[PDB]
């Protein structure tokens, strides 16, 4: 998980570059650490591929699908000595295991805390993943427009775009100018209103129950207080 | 639920890979929801009866190591509850017969119905705990010897040993709290020896306080003989 | 006998590709083909160069340094009128629609460089190719008698292969989406019927 | 609530004012956006209400970062801080207030047991079309809130029937129904009750309360038993 | 020159300097144990309390 | 034995700085260093002045009065081509990237004043410094062989100290955030163990 975070940081570094460039051994120590991380990733879904009680069920769990659009393009990248900023943002989808690994370090010991970190993790992972997607769309162009209507957005400009979008603020200073980009923004507004009206709002309201008679008494000095118990009613 | 969870999940219980799954028709109240949210990987609740086969399958009763049936101590009719628990025993033993079931019985007379059920086997480890009989007997036996109930309660219950330094009664009290009861086959060097000699060798040389014994030879099954005389020798088994 | 969850998710994945094999075919039918077949409407003519002149009106191009520079130089304009064979009229040449839609008044937008003299020489070097070869060797030239009555293209916006990949790869996604569903049912039917051969 | 809202809003406006007056420091403070403080206040009010005109917006990277953090913080303390405290200031009861004394409209207060059955027959005869022109408005005072059938029946008569929640054993409720100005009060007794005498004594209690409030009044009441009728004669008024 | 930095430096050194003094005074008081402060909470301590009227007027004025 | 609320909020404040010591380090790694190390990629050359000329194309600067005035005057352009030592090519000088990105066609944007003659004299005064000292005293000059193949800078956008404060002050915030947590635990452990020395 920590090396997955490191690969995501490598993606964040590589998002400040053009579409591709030719390397041999070093340009920013770019692929040199990426190859090591991805070889460890290959070994990690290697030894749990043999741990599959169902060889098909492991193949379609989205926990190696994230580990699966990344590693063969890294092998092609080191076979060709050039980089590509493709579906590497899918590594951010592995942030869904953050509550699971944070439970291992004895930091969270509360079911409300586990559920809260699960919600924040699926929110941040979905948001960064979709931001990487529409970043990848907007760096390129509409291909029927021969890749000419490219919108040179930073990844983090695009992150700002999705936070302004999902909260229905919509400044319009930054927006998708490509047809495929507008199409994905339509789909993601519908998906965001889907999993806000169906995923969270019955789990948000599990973290909203409060009881209005609890706590203790503030011992104010000088105020002798009486505790009154027994049957208590408007009459008595 | 609280008393059972406390003894079962007591820290002194050390490493036990047993997860308690609770099946009850009534949904848990807020105090139950807090108590179930005090144990995550350890306690799961499910809604449903044990009188429906699908619910037994949902709780995986067949793979379950044992099923414990708890009877409300306070009820309008003791016999009615006892018959409900016997009904639950019949349902579980009809689903999967090779299972241990530990149950609570409010009345001593209602215990016979379990014996009437064919699958139930006492020797197989199926056991029925009669609350009325045990509580009254503990009170009774204590009428003979004042304070026996506390001694017997501190044996089986896992209770946390606390270091006390000051000369109080609690310091001498906790010297015997951490004792428990244990069942064990005797060694082969005790064959044909008298019970007082074996108790002397257990308490003198290796500080064990032996109470009772098994005894079976072609008669009815192996009774529990509390402190036999020198009249009865110790068998190999 | 029941569909297991490995089998069931393969069915859910297999239907997801059958649907998206239709939708990607359905999107590209008017998002890719609608600009394509309008470009394929203009036919190959065989036209001759009428006249090549200049105007004197500058037009502001935009060069760059590479690290996001917005340098804007200027280039002179050249109007290459040609004599069509089919619609036999006086019409301009255009390198593509991208040269046409940005500046229809010019025939050749040079790649914009920093110095104006660099952009000047790229004009006359292109102009020298059309001041020596006039009338002789009539070339293939694309013209539409529907949209642009007086504009002739030199190329297309696309290739012959632009009809291929819009029909191919959603149908490739469609067939593979079927082969997931078919091989799930067939292997299950071999795993539910051949088990009872006892 | 209004104080924490205004204080948070002005504080965050001052923060992003301070950010936007300066620039991004890696841009060597060159992308400064010369915002007034109150332009920035307008920006945050347009932002938090999710209106988002886009005429004014943060053009600095650190500014965009704080606007992301403050949109998340604003949706945090709107979904977690106020909306269970907003809904403490939202509870209203739909049967209270008093009766508008319209001049010329002699109103009747109807009390006693009130239900769809008892109320329907009286309303039908009183509001019958053949009754022609009668300026009498029936006002019903009952402790129990009306059921959905009662709500439909009361919403079949608008300028004619008003319900109010309250007893006739409290003087304030009698004042709310304007009993003193009321032409007459009709007390309806549930025909079906566990004890006839108990209900009869309750209706006599209601008579005593109304005649103690305002003695010069006509009261028409229902009595379940003939023997209980004498108590009304015993009342002096 | 642009001496904007000294203000924030002064406030933060007042914060974590004054925070460490409270921690180390609560360190050395419980480290020396290993090997007229009475009425001063009453001159102004009562005055700070909202119950005092002068105290309420002081809160309103500040 | 319990953490008191003064102790507990110090732990909550101490963790808040340990987290923000990471995040401020994490933000500035690609929000401060990513523009920084690209500027540190261009190396020190030792280049000679090739030629200093003018063009005649005006460029519209923007002066001000002080109380939000948008006065726009104009200034002539000067192209100072220099001969590099390392990449040995004909390339312009630029005062910084800010002079480069706004007007790459000029070498020196003067500070814009109201009168055009004021902006005119600031050009030729700068030009006189480069029309007398030509070829002699080859100066240090920054050039990148990756991004700008024909643009040479005179300065950097930043200093050597730009690597310091992006790594220093989040780590200063990180250590102080640790020292709050450590001294809370240690003083509590001296306040819970040394109390029982009775
Ligand atoms: C290019 C186009 C890309 C656009 C696609 C972006 C979204 C795809 C990913 C969306 C999120 C998918 C992942 C959603 C997901 O996994 O949900 C689940 C998490 O709960 P969890 O597993 O912990 O339950 C534990 C169990 O014990 C419940 O009791
Ligand atoms: C079911 C899903 C199906 C998806 C799979 C099908 C869809 C995906 C492939 C489409 C077919 C191949 C694309 C066409 C490739 C062939 C054409 C090609 O090579 O395009 C290049 C540009 O690429 C560009 O935009 C620049 C971007 C290069 C690719 C970067 C990644 C894009 C990933 C996008 C995702 C160069 O041309 P160029 O500029 O000179 O012309 C402008 C000039 O004429 C100016 O007038
Ligand atoms: C599927 C819809 C995609 C078809 C949209 C399309 O091709 O039209 C383009 C512009 O429209 C568009 O950008 C519309 C993009 C938004 C598509 C939203 C569809 C949601 C369903 C043409 O571009 P033009 O140069 O002709 O103008
Ligand atoms: C630069 C970055 C700056 C950005 C930071 C802006 C927000 C920070 C301040 C947010 C608000 C913090 C203050 C929030 C706060 O104090 O809440 C409390 C108020 O309730 P109160 O005390 O009365 O309860 C009385 C008790 O008796 C409850 O029973
Ligand atoms: C954990 C948190 C860590 C936060 C603490 C660390 C971050 C905060 C300090 C950064 C390091 C010091 C900043 C750099 C100071 C050294 C550099 C400096 O003095 O900058 C001045 C400008 O200031 C400016 O923007 C103008 C604003 C001055 C400061 C006003 C308050 C800003 C507070 C912002 C908050 C002058 O340069 P100048 O213009 O000539 O260059 C453009 C010229 O080259 C045109 O080409
Ligand atoms: C942490 C993210 C901050 C990194 C954002 C960043 O440095 O990119 C700048 C522009 O992007 C940005 O303004 C993005 C600002 C929005 C950041 C939103 C991040 C929310 C998480 C570069 O500026 P440019 O000149 O290269 O374009
Ligand atoms: C948020 C916290 C940690 C920041 C406060 C730390 C202060 C003490 C540090 C952070 C960066 C430092 C500044 C770095 C840049 C200039 C260099 C020079 O022109 C004079 C001093 C000056 C202005 C320094 C003064 C002290 C300084 C402001
Ligand atoms: C309340 C207490 C903590 C105040 C201490 C704050 C310190 C950090 C502040 C307040 C006074 C400040 C000084 C003000 C003026 C002097 C001389 C000037 O030419 C340069 C800066 C310099 C040298 C400053 C250094 C930082 C400074 C010493
Ligand atoms: C040249 O001219 C004719 C008539 O315009 C045209 O049809 C054809 O494209 C060219 N001829 C040949 C043989 O290609
Ligand atoms: C050439 O000249 C004119 C001008 O376009 C045109 O009308 C005529 O048809 C052309 N003749 C030939 C032979 O192409
Ligand atoms: C001047 O010239 C050389 C070669 O370009 C260069 O390496 C160096 O920076 C300068 N020489 C010295 C001694 O600084
Ligand atoms: C100077 O002249 C040319 C023009 O840039 C260049 O190719 C050559 O290398 C330079 N010579 C020296 C000695 O710098």
Author numbering:
A (entry chain D): 120 to 355
B (entry chain A): 356 to 592
C (entry chain H), F (entry chain G): 2008 to 2205
D (entry chain C): 238 to 474
E (entry chain C): 19 to 53, 93 to 119
From the study:
The Slo1 channel, also known as BK or MaxiK, distinguishes itself from other K+ channels by its unusually large single-channel conductance (~10–20 times greater than most other K+ channels) and dual regulation by intracellular Ca2+ and membrane voltage. Because both Ca2+ and membrane voltage gate Slo1, it serves as a hub in numerous physiological processes that couple membrane excitability to Ca2+ signaling events such as muscle contraction, audition, hormone secretion, and neurotransmitter release. Slo1 functions as a tetramer of the pore-forming α subunit, which is encoded by a single gene, Slowpoke (KCNMA1). In this study we present the structures of a mammalian (human) Slo1 channel consisting of the α subunit alone and in complex with the brain-enriched β4 subunit.
The final protein sample of Slo1 co-expressed with the β4 subunit contained both the α subunit and the β4 subunit confirmed by SDS-PAGE and mass spectrometry. Structures of human Slo1 in four distinct states were determined: Ca2+-free and Ca2+-bound α subunit alone as well as Ca2+-free and Ca2+-bound α-β4 complex at resolutions of 4.0 Å, 3.8 Å, 3.5 Å and 3.2 Å, respectively. In each case (presence and absence of β4 subunit) we have determined the structures of Ca2+-activated (open) and Ca2+-depleted (closed) conformations. Likewise, the two Ca2+-free structures of the α subunit (± β4 subunit) are also the same within the accuracy of our measurements (RMSD 1.1 Å). Based on a hypothetical Slo1-β4 model constructed from NMR titration and the β4 EC solution structure, N123 on β4 was suggested to be critical for regulating Slo1 gating through interactions with E264 on the turret of the α subunit upon Ca2+ binding. The distance between sidechains of these two residues was hypothesized to shift from 10.6 Å to 5.5 Å when the channel opens, allowing them to interact. However, these two residues are more than 27 Å apart in our open Slo1-β4 complex structure and remained essentially static in the closed Slo1-β4 complex structure, making any direct interactions very unlikely. Contrasting the large Ca2+-mediated conformational changes that occur within the α subunit pore and gating ring with the absence of conformational change in the β4 subunit gives the impression that the β4 subunits encage the α subunit channel without interfering with its Ca2+-mediated gating conformational changes. Within the outer leaflet of the membrane even lipid molecules that mediate interactions between the α and β subunits remain unperturbed. Within the inner leaflet of the membrane, where large gating conformational changes in the α subunit occur, interfaces between α and β subunits – especially surrounding the more centrally located TM1 of the β subunit – undergo change. The structures support this proposal because the Ca2+ binding sites are unaltered by the presence of β subunits.
